[PDB]
Paper text:
Here, we identify an evolutionarily conserved hexapeptide sequence as the major aggregation-prone region (APR) of gastrointestinal peptides of the glucagon family: xFxxWL. We determine nine polymorphic crystal structures of the APR segments of glucagon-like peptides 1 and 2, and exendin and its derivatives. We propose that the pH-dependent changes of the protonation states of glutamate/aspartate residues of APRs initiate switching between the amyloid and the folded, monomeric forms of the hormones. Our results highlight the dual role of short aggregation core motifs in reversible amyloid formation and receptor binding.
APRTc5b does not contain gatekeeper residues and is thus capable of amyloid formation over a broad range of pH (2 < pH < 11). Four polymorphic crystal forms were grown from solutions of APRTc5b. Although the chains in polymorph B are also arranged according to the class 8 topology, different interactions stabilize the interfaces. While in polymorphs A and C Tyr, Gln, and Trp form H-bonds at the β-sheet/β-sheet interface with each other, this arrangement allows their interactions with water molecules and chain termini. Polymorphs formed in pure aqueous solution are laterally displaced, as the side chains of Tyr, Glu, and Gln rather form H-bonds with the surrounding water molecules.
Residue numbers in the entry: 1 to 6
């Protein structure tokens, strides 16, 4: 799993 929020 990889999550990014910017």
């Amino acid at each position: 799993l990889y999550i990014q929020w910017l």
